[PDB]
Structure formats: C-alpha cells, structure tokens
Amino acid sequence: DQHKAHKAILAYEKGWLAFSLAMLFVFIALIAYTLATHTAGVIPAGKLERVDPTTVRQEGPWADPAQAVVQTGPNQYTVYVLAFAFGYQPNPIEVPQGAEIVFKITSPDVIHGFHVEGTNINVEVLPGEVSTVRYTFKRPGEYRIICNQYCGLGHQNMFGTIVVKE
Amino acid sequence: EEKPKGALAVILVLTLTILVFWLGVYAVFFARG
Amino acid sequence: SEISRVYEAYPEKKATLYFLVLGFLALIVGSLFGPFQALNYGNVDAYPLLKRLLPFVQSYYQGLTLHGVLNAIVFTQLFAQAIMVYLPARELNMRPNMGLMWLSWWMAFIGLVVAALPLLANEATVLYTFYPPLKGHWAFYLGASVFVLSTWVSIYIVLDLWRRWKAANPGKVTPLVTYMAVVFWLMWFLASLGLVLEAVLFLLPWSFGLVEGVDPLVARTLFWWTGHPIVYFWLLPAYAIIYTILPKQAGGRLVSDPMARLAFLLFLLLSTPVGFHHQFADPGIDPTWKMIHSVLTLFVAVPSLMTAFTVAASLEFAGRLRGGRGLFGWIRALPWDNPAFVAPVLGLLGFIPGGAGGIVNASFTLDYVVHNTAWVPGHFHLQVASLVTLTAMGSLYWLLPNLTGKPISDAQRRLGLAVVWLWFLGMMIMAVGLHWAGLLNVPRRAYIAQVPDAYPHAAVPMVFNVLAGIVLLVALLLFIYGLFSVLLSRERKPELAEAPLPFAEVISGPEDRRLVLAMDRIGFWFAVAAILVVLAYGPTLVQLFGHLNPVPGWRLW
C-alpha cells in the first residue's frame, strides 16, 4: 500500500501496453486491406515525373484544354489537369461514368491542392512535378474541386468542376 | 488498497474515443471510394 | 551587484523569467488573430473591424502567418528553453553557464525581431510552413534560422550541466528531470537537422539572390523531417512538468520513475523518422515509404498511451489520499481551486479526442479523407493550444512566485480559474466545429467568410465556431488583464521565491534499478536515434537530391 501500489500498477502498465500494441496492429491490418483494393488508387505514384513549370501552358499535354482528356484504354482516360493561380484547366472536366480516370496534374506557379468533394481524390500539386492519381466515379453528377493548399489571396476562391457524364 | 480502477475507466474512455474516431473515419473513407 | 540579488545567487531565474515573459508575449500577440479566425470559420467576417483596431494588417492570411509563427514556433520554443533548462539546473542545484545562457536569449530576441519586421510589413505572408515556391523577405528566413539556432546553444547548456554533475557524482544514475531534459535536448538536435539544411542549403541563398529557385519536394521533405518531432519538442516540456511536478500540486506522488523514463526514451527513438505522415498526399515519394512512416507514427503514439495510464494513476492515488471517495470519488478530491492543477488536467482531457484524431491522421489512406481540411486545425488546437498552452498558463502560479517572489493573491487565483475554464470550454467547442466542418470538406487556411454561400452543409458547425470566437475572445482578454496584473502589481514576498519547485516524490519499487540503469545507457540510444533517422530518410533523400528541379519563386499576395 504505496509499495504494494507499485507492484500492481507496474503489471497494468504491461497489460495496457500489450492491449495497445494489439489494437494498433489491427489498425495496421485494416490499412493493409485498403492498399490491396481499388480504393488504393488515390495514392500518388512513386515515380518522379519531372516537368518545367515555366513551359507547361505552352508546350506538352498541359498547353491545350481541348486535349486534356485523352483515351488511354477501352475504359481508361488520362486527364491533363492544370492547377494554377486561381483555377483549373480545363473547366469542366467531363469524364464518362464507370471508367478509370487517371488524373495527371501539375502547376505553373506555386503549390496547390486538388481535392474532389465526395471522393478521396486529395493531392498536392507541386510546380515541376506530376501528381498521378486514379479513380472511378460510381455515379454521375457535378463534383466540385476545392483547392486546399494556401497559394495566395485568390485561395478561398479556387474551385473547379468535374462533370461525370451519365 | 488494491485496483487503480479510476485509471482503468480513464484508459477505457480513451480506447472508445480512439475506436469511434478510427471506425467513423474508416466508414467515411469507404463511402467515398 | 543586483538588489533582487535573487539574480546573483540564483541568476538562472533572471534568464528563465526572460524567456517566459517573451514567450507569453508572442502568445498574446499571436492569439489576437485567433477569434478573428474563429468567426471566419463561423462565416462572419470581422476583418474590417480588425483592420480598424490594427491598421498594419493587409489580409486574413497575414493574420494566419502571425498567428502561426508567433503562437506555434515562437511561444512554444521559448517555453521549452525555459522549462527544459531551469528545471534540470534546479533539481541538480547547479549553475547553467550564464554566458552561453544569456547568449541564447539574445539569439532569440534578435531572431524574433529580424523576422517580425518583414512579417509586420506584409513581406513574408507564406504561413508558418513557408512552402517553396512562395517567396519571402531575406529577413524572415534569416530571423527564423537564428531563432531556431537559439535552441542549439540551449542543447549545449543542458549537456554542460549534465557532464559536470556526473564527474562530481560518479557511479550515480542520472536523476529524473535531468534525464528527461537530456534526451529531449538530444532529440531536438537530431530532429532539427531537416529545417537547418533546408534553410542553409536552400532558403537562405534563394531569398538573398544567390540562386534562382528551389525544388519544392526536397524543401517540403526537409521541413517535415523537422516538422513532426517539433510537435514533440512542444509536447515534452508539458509532459516534464506533468510527470514530475503536477502529482505534487495534486497532493500525490509520481507512481513510476521508469515509466516516465521509458516514455521519454521512446520519444527519442521515434519522434524524427515519421515525417511522411505529413506527406501522404505528395507526389514523388514512394508509397512503400509512406507505410513504414505510417507504422512508425503509430508506434510514436505508444509512449503517450503509457503516459495516459501513469498520469491517470498518479491523480487517482492522490485523489484517494484526500479521502477520495468511490470509483469517481477521487476526481472530486483533487485540488479544483488551484489553476496550477486545473490547467494541465483540463488539457489532458481535451488530449483524449486530440490523440484520437492523430491516430486517424497517421493511418496513411484515412488521411485522404481529412488532409488539408478544417479537421487538421481541429486536432492540433486540442494538442498544442489546449494541452501545451494550458500547461504553460497554469504554471504561472508556481513558476512566477518561484522566480520573482510575487505571491498570487486570491482575486488573482480566481481570475486564473476563470481563464483556464473559459480557455478550455472555448477550445472544446472550437474542436467540434472544425472536426465536423472538415468532415464536410471545408478547406483549411482559407478566408471562407469571403465566400459565404460556398459551404452551406457547414451551417451548424459554423454556429459552433462563432460561439467559440466570442468565448475565446473573453478568455484572452481576461488573460491579458491578469498576466499583467500578476506582474505589474507592486508586491514581492519572496520566501516563496527561492523555495524549490514542487518536485514530486516517486513511489519507488524493486523492479527499478536494472531498468533505470539500461535507459541511462544514453550514448547507445542517441546513436540508435541517428541510425533510425538515417534509414528512414536515407533512400528517399538520396533519390531526390540527384533530381533537383528548382523552380522560380513567386509572391502571390
């Protein structure tokens, strides 16, 4: 009792740390599950795709809004998205429902975010580098793109639209 | 005395909060997937 | 001489009082933008009113930076430099080198000063993360760098005192507070490498003219090498106070020396190699290296789950000792009329949901739900601005007596409680509104009040954010009229003021000794700390440092 107190209490320390490690690993488990499913598609790609942000809206696939969506499989689209000081090229992004969409996004100025309301598309856009995520919209409608990385005073106004065709 | 049971009810609330948050956010993640 | 000769028998008090006053001063100025930012997330625009009161201010986002830098970089470090030096020296009744010590306070005062000026004059509106390629005045980074370099001196000072007590005391195991402070200061050196490279290798030359651009991926990867454990550099001063000072204010004992020690050794191994939990949604970083940092962050939570049990048991024991009634009897026996006790206890409670938010954040793919929304500021307001800050606030009531011999009156004690309870109740209400607003997709870092029609699903959590701006306005104002009323009063009754820091007796035990002996194998674990940083950041930094792709700086404000 004040030293018996000790002997107990330090055994609990052991049981709480055991339980804790257990629960923690179950979490590691259920993350693991997600990386194996389709949902893992939102994770940005490893490979360093270098581009030159000063040249990007002149030459390459980010130079022409008309050419942003480019069929890349029987059920696949690559979208070249430009995130810039203070909206999105193209606008809207029209994509068919059911299809794998491969967003390839970059910026000509400062870092942006490209986050799509109601999806787990949530990525940082860095000048000089291509952010590559994939997604399949399971139902049609308009999806608002919010820019969630501070980039200057137009920040609170940077929104885009994705139209996913019926 | 014996059992530090006040401290157990503390770590119990802590465990539950941890599970409501992680399970709630897991469910949202799937629903947007 | 010196007639509060206080400062020539125990001069360390003179320097600690300095840090502290400076720390809390940055915190009054920083927090002034708080409620303004709160009513904004409530969808009221009080900025034209602010810009009245403070004509120098040009945008919501200048606010945000001052708030950030002033509250989270400057208030917290200066609070760590105080606590983490003064406590070690006092538990070891020894002099910190008042030469090296007085230096650090001046490296910080120059530092803060040089930085403040471009900030105040709208030249460095890049926020507390200052992400390239956004470009600030040379003054900001030069300031920042030298301010952050104040800690390195602090490092040496504590290590100094450590080395001298050992020689005078050979065979003797390292005493508790000191051991803490020793690994703390060690962590922070290892951790601070990231920010230090990023400044020297990139930020400094760039903002001077010496080069043309920076690679934004490397910049952000060095930043977050530092940027995570810097949160643990804020947390552990409070933890040090909470482990070894608060059970005494509670009327109790620290139930365990080892556990306190095992906690802090753990923060030394795992605080630094976890930085990619901040980068889950970056391009060009391998998914496999996100999972490992994921796993590793989840391990960093473990010393803190432990803490929860040790502290809970210490407060329980003390409770019982004061006739602490039944299953919950013990809670009502604790000293609820001492702001020294209330503050860190209320912060511990808010730390329950906050740590829970971290765990989600940490879990790789779950971060895609919440990253860069209002949830993130939801979470860390519970962590840094409730726990750490409340521990700093409620510690005005022991430390200040002990440093100046001003006693706390009884009208002041009661002011203390009205702040602490208002501060807490306002923090909790803001937590809900921002967790929820963020689960509705409302971005962080945004003048959302300017787009009032933009997030209409957020209506009621917006009612919670307004409701907290007013509550935290009152709290901040009642804190100023009282911080200054504890200081500018004309009483000094300093028997109170030599009078050792209420350090805590420890319930000793058998299974101590050989375990306390291993954890005291310091040089070994410090090196393990470096091996772990090296493996975590090694393969990725090697990759990126041979693909440097610097880009022009912009100013977009």
Ligand code: HAS
């Ligand atoms: C001072 C500050 C902070 C602490 C401490 C802190 C803890 C954690 N955080 Fe965090 N955080 C993240 C994950 C964690 C994890 C795993 C922990 C762990 O260290 C938490 C472990 C904690 C616990 C498991 C709680 C234990 C509970 C205790 C100890 C209380 C018990 C109560 C008692 C004993 C009272 C009983 C008494 C009675 C009287 C009843 C992640 C992701 O993995 C992100 C990035 C996500 C994103 O999208 O950016 C992040 C973002 C932030 C940012 C934003 C950075 C920026 O500006 O971009 C800040 C400032 C911050 C602060 C802090 N954070 N965090």
Ligand code: HEM
């Ligand atoms: C005084 C009461 C306070 C209020 C009403 C308040 C309110 C807020 C709000 C509503 C935001 C989010 C704004 C945005 O993301 O655009 C924010 C951001 C922040 N707060 Fe506070 N806060 C207070 C005190 C504190 C304290 C004491 C600290 C730290 C010691 C703190 C640290 C921060 C940091 C680091 C950020 C984000 C900076 C950034 O995103 O660049 N706050 N605050």
Ligand SMILES: CCCCCCCCCO[C@@H]1O[C@H](CO)[C@@H](O)[C@H](O)[C@H]1O
């Ligand atoms: C402290 C937390 C208080 C929590 C308040 C309730 C949280 C519910 C979040 O609603 C979310 O709304 C989105 C539509 O905008 C959908 O994407 C998603 O299916 C749904 O889950």
Ligand SMILES: CCCCCCCCCO[C@@H]1O[C@H](CO)[C@@H](O)[C@H](O)[C@H]1O
């Ligand atoms: C052999 C070269 C090593 C460099 C020497 C380090 C000392 C740096 C000067 O610091 C000064 O030390 C004094 C003595 O404590 C203080 O009184 C003084 O105010 C402080 O600024």
Ligand SMILES: CCCCCCCCCO[C@@H]1O[C@H](CO)[C@@H](O)[C@H](O)[C@H]1O
């Ligand atoms: C419980 C959550 C509700 C929020 C409002 C709580 C404020 C009440 C706390 O006041 C405390 O009351 C004690 C009497 O019990 C006194 O010992 C102590 O001097 C005083 O500070």
Ligand SMILES: CCCCCCCCCO[C@@H]1O[C@H](CO)[C@@H](O)[C@H](O)[C@H]1O
């Ligand atoms: C009229 C009193 C009878 C009802 C009893 C319920 C009291 C609710 C207090 O719990 C509070 O809930 C918040 C979330 O809502 C938490 O964030 C916070 O830590 C906690 O203090």
Ligand code: CUA
């Ligand atoms: Cu682009 Cu905010």
Ligand SMILES: [Cu+]
């Ligand atoms: Cu972190």
